[PDB]
Write a protein that binds this ligand. Structure first.
Ligand SMILES: O=C(C1CC1)N1CCN(c2ccnn3cc(-c4ccc(N5CCNCC5)cc4)cc23)CC1
Length: 297
């Protein structure tokens, strides 16, 4: 198989999800995500997704193959994709600051990535609508040309409008809590409705928008990298911790005033706020957000 022709070179990530390695395969770098036992359904669902739906897009992490392998004293579950040496947005934002152009390129490209997933394309070159359900800075990769690509589709949801059936899988994993929409947290989400799942992505996206914006320099100031809600939740926040801050207190990420000196960060502040409506139906769509980012300077 592919697994046995891969040589594993360097561990570049370690978490509750398992591990990420840089390895080589046919002389090309690849990322090998080795899944924890707790997350094996994600590997299954993502293997399934990648093997049923044509997802390939500049801003979706490029899939190579999935495989099992008899490794250590276990059978490892590996998902093998293209490799982005910059790492995640999370990693990258912590090593550097952005300018107007690099900020816009990052956030637009993610918008385009989200929009492509969310839309249904009809016909044999088409696809079902897909909702990610766990978008965050750690599972968006940064390419050297400055564009991003979305990974980690283990919790994805698909829907098609001809069939009007909704595939949610059978996954014990629910999203990353720090990024969880109000309606998910207070359990008011309309689970029968596909638009609900898209709308949770937008919330999450708006939180990412904020992480990124903080690192864009204006007039030679910039904010330190911070995860959304850093000031009001501890590390690894509970589902209950978040409900209190997001739903009960209706708190939203603080916009620093320095952003209002700058016409880009002013326009993105408006944008991220229209991703954070308590009312899901008031949130902008991926496509609209894409159209807007395309017109900002
Ligand atoms: O599933 C996830 C999230 C939940 C972790 N993914 C997919 C698996 N990942 C990767 C996919 C595809 N490429 N890729 C490159 C890195 C990577 C590369 C370098 C670094 N570092 C280590 C810290 N010092 C600087 C460079 C970190 C991560 C990580 C990944 C991470 C994002």
């Amino acid at each position: 198989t592919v697994a046995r022709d891969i040589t594993l070179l360097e561990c570049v990530g370690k978490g509750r999800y398992g591990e990420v390695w840089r390895g080589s395969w046919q002389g090309e770098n690849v990322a090998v995500k080795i899944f924890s036992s707790r997350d094996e359904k994600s590997w299954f669902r993502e293997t399934e997704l990648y093997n049923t739906v044509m997802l390939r897009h500049e801003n979706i992490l490029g899939f190579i193959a999935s495989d099992m392998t008899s490794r250590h004293s276990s059978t490892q579950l590996w998902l093998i994709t293209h490799y982005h040496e910059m790492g995640s947005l999370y990693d990258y934002l912590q090593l550097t600051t952005l300018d107007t152009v690099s900020c816009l390129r990052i956030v637009l490209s993610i918008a385009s990535g989200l929009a492509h997933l969310h839309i249904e394309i009809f016909g044999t070159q088409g696809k079902p609508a897909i909702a990610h359900r766990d978008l965050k800075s750690k599972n968006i990769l940064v390419k050297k040309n400055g564009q991003c690509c979305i990974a980690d589709l283990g919790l994805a949801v698909m829907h098609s409008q001809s069939t009007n059936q909704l595939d949610v899988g059978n996954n014990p994993r629910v999203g990353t809590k720090r990024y969880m929409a109000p309606e998910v947290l207070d359990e008011t989400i309309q689970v029968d409705c596909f638009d609900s799942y898209k709308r949770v992505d937008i919330w999450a996206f708006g939180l990412v928008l904020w992480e990124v914006a903080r690192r864009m320099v204006s007039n030679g100031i910039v904010e330190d990298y911070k995860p959304p809600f850093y000031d009001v939740v501890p590390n690894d926040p509970s589902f209950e911790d978040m409900r209190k801050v997001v739903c009960v207190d209706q708190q939203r990420p603080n916009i620093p005033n320095r952003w209002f000196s700058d016409p880009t960060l002013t326009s993105l502040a408006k944008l991220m706020k229209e991703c954070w409506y308590q009312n899901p139906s008031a949130r902008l769509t991926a496509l609209r957000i894409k159209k807007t980012l395309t017109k900002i300077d």
